[PDB]
Design a protein around this motif. Structure first.
Motif, PDB file in Angstrom:
ATOM      1  N   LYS A   1       0.834  -1.376  -0.070  1.00 14.76           N
ATOM      2  CA  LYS A   1      -0.068  -0.069   0.067  1.00 14.76           C
ATOM      3  C   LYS A   1       0.754   1.311   0.127  1.00 14.76           C
ATOM      4  N   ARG A   2       2.201   1.236   0.197  1.00 13.74           N
ATOM      5  CA  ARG A   2       2.856   2.275   0.426  1.00 13.74           C
ATOM      6  C   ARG A   2       4.113   2.402  -0.849  1.00 13.74           C
ATOM      7  N   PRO A   3       4.138   3.371  -1.573  1.00 11.14           N
ATOM      8  CA  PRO A   3       5.179   3.341  -3.075  1.00 11.14           C
ATOM      9  C   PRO A   3       6.630   3.720  -2.214  1.00 11.14           C
ATOM     10  N   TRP A   4       6.890   4.367  -1.245  1.00  9.03           N
ATOM     11  CA  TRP A   4       7.952   4.752  -0.806  1.00  9.03           C
ATOM     12  C   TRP A   4       8.716   3.445   0.069  1.00  9.03           C
ATOM     13  N   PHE A   5       8.054   2.307   0.184  1.00  9.84           N
ATOM     14  CA  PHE A   5       8.372   0.980   0.541  1.00  9.84           C
ATOM     15  C   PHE A   5       9.044   0.322  -0.421  1.00  9.84           C
ATOM     16  N   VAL A   6      10.491   0.107  -0.800  1.00  6.68           N
ATOM     17  CA  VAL A   6      11.031  -0.411  -1.959  1.00  6.68           C
ATOM     18  C   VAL A   6      11.857  -1.870  -1.562  1.00  6.68           C
ATOM     19  N   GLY A   7      11.553  -2.391  -0.514  1.00  7.53           N
ATOM     20  CA  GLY A   7      12.354  -3.781  -0.341  1.00  7.53           C
ATOM     21  C   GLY A   7      11.940  -4.454   0.856  1.00  7.53           C
ATOM     22  N   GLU A   8      12.118  -5.657   0.712  1.00  5.99           N
ATOM     23  CA  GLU A   8      11.888  -6.582   2.144  1.00  5.99           C
ATOM     24  C   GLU A   8      12.958  -7.638   2.055  1.00  5.99           C
ATOM     25  N   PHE A   9      13.611  -7.812   3.148  1.00 10.28           N
ATOM     26  CA  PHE A   9      14.449  -8.732   3.648  1.00 10.28           C
ATOM     27  C   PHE A   9      13.960  -9.743   4.620  1.00 10.28           C
ATOM     28  N   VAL A  10      13.775 -11.079   4.299  1.00 11.63           N
ATOM     29  CA  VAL A  10      13.187 -11.749   5.214  1.00 11.63           C
ATOM     30  C   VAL A  10      14.302 -12.289   6.188  1.00 11.63           C
ATOM     31  N   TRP A  11      13.874 -12.545   7.523  1.00 12.20           N
ATOM     32  CA  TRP A  11      14.730 -13.514   8.363  1.00 12.20           C
ATOM     33  C   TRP A  11      14.054 -14.688   8.741  1.00 12.20           C
ATOM     34  N   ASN A  12      14.738 -15.674   8.465  1.00 14.59           N
ATOM     35  CA  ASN A  12      16.135 -15.706   7.615  1.00 14.59           C
ATOM     36  C   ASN A  12      16.085 -16.645   6.571  1.00 14.59           C
ATOM     37  N   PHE A  13      17.112 -16.536   5.900  1.00  8.30           N
ATOM     38  CA  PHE A  13      17.277 -17.724   4.769  1.00  8.30           C
ATOM     39  C   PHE A  13      16.976 -19.018   5.151  1.00  8.30           C
ATOM     40  N   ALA A  14      17.612 -19.543   6.276  1.00  6.34           N
ATOM     41  CA  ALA A  14      17.530 -20.815   6.631  1.00  6.34           C
ATOM     42  C   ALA A  14      17.781 -20.959   8.374  1.00  6.34           C
ATOM     43  N   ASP A  15      17.762 -21.952   8.762  1.00  9.34           N
ATOM     44  CA  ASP A  15      17.871 -22.220  10.271  1.00  9.34           C
ATOM     45  C   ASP A  15      19.504 -22.233  10.677  1.00  9.34           C
ATOM     46  N   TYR A  16      19.917 -21.287  11.781  1.00  4.74           N
ATOM     47  CA  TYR A  16      21.220 -21.345  12.098  1.00  4.74           C
ATOM     48  C   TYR A  16      21.400 -21.816  13.518  1.00  4.74           C
ATOM     49  N   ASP A  17      22.440 -22.202  13.962  1.00  4.97           N
ATOM     50  CA  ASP A  17      22.596 -22.329  15.172  1.00  4.97           C
ATOM     51  C   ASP A  17      23.112 -21.107  16.378  1.00  4.97           C
ATOM     52  N   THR A  18      22.574 -21.174  17.391  1.00  3.88           N
ATOM     53  CA  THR A  18      22.649 -20.161  18.356  1.00  3.88           C
ATOM     54  C   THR A  18      23.306 -20.464  19.751  1.00  3.88           C
ATOM     55  N   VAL A  19      23.299 -19.634  20.647  1.00  4.10           N
ATOM     56  CA  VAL A  19      23.808 -19.718  22.222  1.00  4.10           C
ATOM     57  C   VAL A  19      22.604 -20.863  22.745  1.00  4.10           C
TER      58      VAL A  19
END
Lengths: 597, 595, 596
Positions: free
Chosen positions: A539-557
């Motif tokens: 709905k917003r023309p000044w929104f120009v990108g989306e980066f999803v988190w995440n590509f894949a499942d990774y390890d962590t603490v």
């Protein structure tokens, strides 16, 4: 800092294999580099060391220094060249001897370093290469680690209880990282040994233009006339010029474009005396115009993953097979871009995106500059000079990739609790990165979910990047109100006349958990989450990108928040698509790279 | 008194598929006499949340729901008193018969009755309507959370105006201050039963171990009362003629959990035209020093914390699941169950009676707290409803030999206001010893807290604490968890009391393995119990251990709960995880008597 | 010999991301000198089949694929013999340099070479094209099925008209006669190395426990040849001035699996300007009755069967996964590994030498069988290629101390045609003993069959059997499975040979639990091993057990393989199933030496 090559002048020798390896401690002089390692054990280089010996958990959880060692030999007939030992990375702090003599010291786990070792490696002889590798993160490192009194990110404590507090003090020490990914360490990237002529090319800069003019600058040590040539994808020379500085022009230039465009790559071929070096590049402009971001004048829409260097056994170590598989699933997804959270990636990643037409947002390892509302890190954390060296290291290293289009200084710093201090710290680096990039690419800073009205620094970047877990970490489970709250903040962003991208967002999803009603952690919730929030983006023309988190499942603490690693991946760790990926695929099946506006 | 069928009483279940409609917050939205409009079927007994997935309306409902069904009394079934009984309705109820308010009840896990002898005559078809309110808050047991407070284990970004506008504008929804899902509806079986017009009302049995068995039956009529004690085969081995007194059982058989034989006599009691049988077992429980003697033998509690939770059924009653879960307790070599966090269906205690399973019985009083900022003992209108609910439970479950301990509630705020809490819990601990004819021991399950400031947990007959070293604190490091545990244990030894760990566990996703025993993996669960249980066995005053939980169960959505609570030793469908096999093996080496 | 780097030899890696096109069934399709058309990037070494999921073309390809990259030898690297070496190409290769053919190879798991100095001068760049054919059939090893046979473990409704018509019109796929996915591509590291123009050719070291080491160094030049045994620290302990002969080591430290120490010596050999180092281990191997002796000691194998199999890598080689497995192999209290069903990379065997792990070395000779209808011994042209690949294997691994046992092949039809079966296998038993200087035991791994009609497997130096009692037969009933196992064991007792169980396991999905241990659940895996393993111990001639498999591995789609084979004690990403912790405890209490 040029990436090593193999031609008629230069030998490329891979020192990768299985070295000898020994755990150490916090004592930085605990072994004698000149003498062999005691009770060594085999360890695979390049890869983390952490998931390589499950006989005990000592490797996985180690605290302090580890020690690598291997013999290196120069055959006697590889005569009179200039020999260089190069490390793609050593994580985080490295020390490097040869025959006992110190030849390198590096800080920073994700940028390469070298040593000119011609005077200690003659033809015929054999040397003892010893590398010490410190995994410790703290208030001086990037990424930041926390120190006594604070916890790790997403930590869980019963703070005041005597039994717990005495335990914490009696507890064994371990890195407590102010970032959400596992602290993998070791020699992660290919260890090269290479040769150049005694008088050599040492740096190549290339700044191209959409009409076909290319500015270039080839730096040298000797006194030979430099001559350059531009080659096409087939290998035919199409222009030429005979000075070290100047401009060269490519008639009918092929522009570099992500699919459906052609990611057409050129080569600059620099000869100078006996020396030769082939710099790769692509011809493509980027201009931020108002609330647009133009690629060859066409308005761009980023359909991108946030990624990680993370895989079974390899950990954060490099893997070309994984790289090819991953890029093809990005092409499978109908995505066109990638963010390199939260550290610069291996060199070879960007060559592949070059070759494969995938836009990249190159990010420094500056994640975790934040201490809560009672701790001002800008005053109390000694980071600015390490930040500046590593910001430079990255730009100097990828200055020539067409796939990079956006610089990111860092990730989720405390921009709200001490606003003007944060501006005074981050703006000097926004300017720096503009002085440092010969192509002048846009700069950003990726920001926390935070009080965006107290924050004064995010909106001042060239492209605003926000991290928003509406309906996950807040208003949990309810995409009606999640969508409401997002739109409020989106109205605030409409007022700032910048182009904006959602630069993380996601929902932990366990592969297998389904529910008719799309509840948290199920696969069907991930489809709701993206589908609901994505429809407000459009709905917003000044929104120009989306980066999803995440590509894949990774390890962590370890911690009650992270079900054996982060789980917001759109793929599992073995790169298997969850339900939410099939939804994303169809959405990006219908959003074109160019001309979405 | 639990409904029976004999020559005097008829029993009759109204369980089945009733009509059902979603309500609002108007307790007067429908006309309790005219048929429900736009009704849809619904299975009774069961929660209603998981029975209709066309939408998420029923799962996520906020407010009242409405049941309806015709009831018919066969004309040839006359001259009797007619009783309408509900085993439970969660949480607040309101029943009508042909439009007439015949009952109201507050509290979702205790039963209530209506006498309907004059509203349903033989030959008549009357229309039963029930209104069910799921809402929880500061007046409920279990406790909800009113405006400006998160759901328990919930997550927020406190101050961001965009999040704050979204909260004020969001659809309302219960915010449990308890870590389980707020399943609601008619959970236990509805029942239409008949008695003689002058009937037996109440039976109390205090049995001692020499053989003497004090008793007391309460009759409405005038006829003399005679009672006979029937042994396991149904043989009269003694008798007496008087409504109250003492019968001696020649050569008693003591009730015992496995290894022991769980022996149950019956009190055959007749008055006039009327009969009632009260099952009862003959055993002693004494807290002597730092020991818990059962029939004079020192006891140890290889226990489970259970829940009432299962697929589709929700919190509903499942007799089948009961038999299963109880033969799994036996497979595990367990002997005791804690009834987290509410009284269970009665049939469960009748099964534990016959199968030899110690029971800690617990009220719905969980979530009595709200941080150091809020004093619940000054702010929440609870104290009244808490003494009723405790009365209802003890009166309901007094005659069970399986119940060996009452618990006042689970995890109140006992530290931030140390004396205000002693001033609320101690009368209840007093009330509990009063209503119980058998003076059973009393406890209160304490959450993880500053045990040095809490003055009231250590004042119970058995101490019962909930600890998660290695899980919520000191995550992943069992070296440090045992060190911290032993530190609190050093405090509990100076208190010269019997001490049981009444919750402890680690979320475990069946599936995930690691060679390195990492949180959420099947192998870390083993390291948790194996390293904490080792430190227990060094403490000669530490008499019990109830693992949380027996099985995974649903919760409210939240980034801390992987589609419900995953600390079960079983999955929801009762398949065992690796740490179960470990527990079952450890409890095969620990004797219930004399450890 | 394995490529080296010293003052004499250079070793370059041609690993990396190459250009790659899909071909067809045309050996003739693309020109080996011109660049590939519509090429895509691909990682080498690794399988190609899991690397472009934009499509299933790569996973499911039938036929030839094409690989390419440019090779520059620098100007200053002059005056040496330059060799190009493929660690492997699966299964058949043609390799061109600047358009000129320089190698052909049939055989997917053994290295091959082309001496190339005459065509890669210092300073220039050659176009190196590799074409790799993935097709298996009745002439390959491993064996592929041809028209009118299904894939091994495949299913069908035979005879239905719509079915039989669709089986013919269907796009051609390989139908492997084996239970593992047909990974293909350049799987092992690709090397470019140098030697002085007259160079050391071959090294052959036979040691004996007494210190004496017979040795032999073949050369092309005419210089005289020096040898010097080097110790674990690199000091020189013996010496000779002759290219054959024997040398004596004082207080020789022997090589032993744990609890022993796996001591390793080097033979340092100079000849002219050339150098080479050949590691070796001093330890004795003797089948003596129904015992197998390692330095005189009775030995009991606690092995895994393995596979070269992993996410993304396929059957590609992974130096990291290798060190992690060997460490999981120690953590398990295991001491042995079987190279099911092919020779592994050389670096795996280098690892086991160091780590102290007994190996059993298996040719790609799986699937020599087509049921009762077909006599492979008369109808499959396998015989010469078997002898070829038998020799390639034994030449390459002859100096490894970890290899204690040869396996000529796996699961061949030994009961439908009993005599043909022996006449085909018993020469290969003889050949292996001829071609091997240390004369190690040789065996043949037999599928579950009628053992009273098998005249072949009871004649190997060690009897190795694959049984699946309680799984493929007598299903879910361990009471009956021990009964059946026990009746067959009474038959092997009469044969007076040492016996190992070389495969047995049960498909187990991670996280399927059942109280009562039903098939596919972790608890039934525990039961399947615990029950069978109890009978192994009652019998003094049963000297080893090799579980199938170390880890879940991929396989071709059929209704009997749940996205691969799941008999792994570990999952594909190397997480231990409940079945593993059991075996880890069992092997805790069973010594390597002197159990029987």
């Amino acid at each position: 800092m040029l990436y090593p090559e193999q031609n008629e002048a230069r030998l490329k020798l891979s020192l990768d294999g299985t070295w000898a390896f020994a755990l150490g401690s916090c004592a930085e002089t605990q072994f004698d580099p000149a003498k062999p390692l005691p009770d060594a054990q085999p360890i695979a280089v390049p890869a983390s060391y952490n998931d390589q010996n499950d006989q005990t958990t000592a490797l996985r959880r180690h605290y302090g220094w580890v020690w690598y060692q291997r013999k290196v030999t120069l055959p006697a007939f590889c005569a009179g060249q200039r020999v260089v030992l190069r490390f793609g990375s050593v994580t985080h702090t490295a020390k490097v001897w040869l025959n006992g003599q110190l030849i390198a010291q590096h800080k920073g786990g994700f940028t390469p370093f070298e040593a000119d070792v011609t005077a200690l490696l003659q033809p015929g002889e054999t040397a003892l290469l010893t590398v010490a590798c410190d995994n410790r993160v703290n208030h001086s490192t990037l990424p930041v680690g926390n120190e006594d009194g604070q916890l790790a990110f997403f930590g869980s404590d019963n703070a005041g209880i005597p039994s717990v507090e005495a335990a914490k003090r009696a507890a064994a020490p371990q890195n407590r990282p102010n970032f959400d990914f596992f602290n993998y360490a070791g020699i992660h990237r290919p260890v090269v040994l290479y040769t150049t002529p005694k008088e050599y090319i040492e740096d190549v800069t290339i700044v191209p233009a959409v009409d076909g003019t290319v500015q270039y600058a080839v730096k040298t040590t000797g006194s030979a006339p430099v001559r350059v040539t531009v080659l096409d994808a087939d290998g035919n020379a199409v222009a030429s010029a005979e000075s070290a500085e100047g401009t060269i022009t490519i008639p009918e230039v092929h522009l570099w474009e992500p699919r459906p465009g052609t990611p057409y790559l050129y080569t600059l071929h620099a000869t100078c005396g006996a020396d030769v070096y082939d710099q790769t590049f692509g011809v493509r402009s980027i201009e931020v115009r108002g609330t647009q971001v133009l690629l060859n004048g066409k308005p761009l829409y980023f359909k991108g993953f946030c990624k990680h260097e993370d895989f079974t056994a390899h950990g954060r170590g490099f893997d070309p097979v994984l790289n090819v598989k991953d890029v093809n699933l990005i092409h499978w997804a109908n995505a066109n871009a990638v963010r390199t959270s939260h550290y610069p990636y291996a060199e070879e990643f960007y060559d592949l995106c070059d070759r494969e037409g995938i836009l990249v947002m190159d990010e420094t390892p500056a994640v975790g500059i934040g201490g809560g509302a009672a701790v001002n890190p800008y005053k109390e954390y000694p980071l600015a000079e390490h930040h500046r060296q590593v910001l430079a290291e990255m730009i100097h290293r990828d200055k020539n990739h067409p796939c990079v289009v956006l610089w990111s200084l860092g990730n989720e710093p405390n921009l709200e609790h001490f606003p003007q201090d944060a501006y005074d710290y981050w703006h000097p680096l926004y300017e720096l990165a503009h002085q440092l990039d010969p192509q002048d690419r846009p700069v950003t800073l990726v920001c926390c979910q935070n009080d965006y009205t107290k924050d004064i620094t995010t909106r001042t970047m060239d492209i605003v990047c926000i991290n928003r877990y509406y309906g996950w970490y807040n208003l949990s489970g309810d995409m009606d109100a999640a969508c409401y709250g997002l739109n409020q903040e989106l109205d605030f962003w409409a007022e700032q006349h910048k182009p904006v991208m959602m630069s993380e967002y996601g929902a932990d999803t366990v592969a297998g958990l389904h529910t008719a009603g799309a509840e948290m952690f199920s696969e069907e919730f991930q489809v709701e989450f993206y589908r609901r929030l994505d429809a407000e983006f459009d709905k917003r023309p000044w929104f120009v990108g989306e980066f999803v988190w995440n590509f894949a499942d990774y390890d962590t603490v370890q911690g009650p928040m992270r079900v054996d690693g982060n789980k917001k991946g759109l793929f599992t760790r073995d790169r298997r698509p969850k339900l939410g990926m099939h939804f994303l695929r169809q959405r990006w099946a219908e959003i074109p790279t160019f001309g979405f506006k």
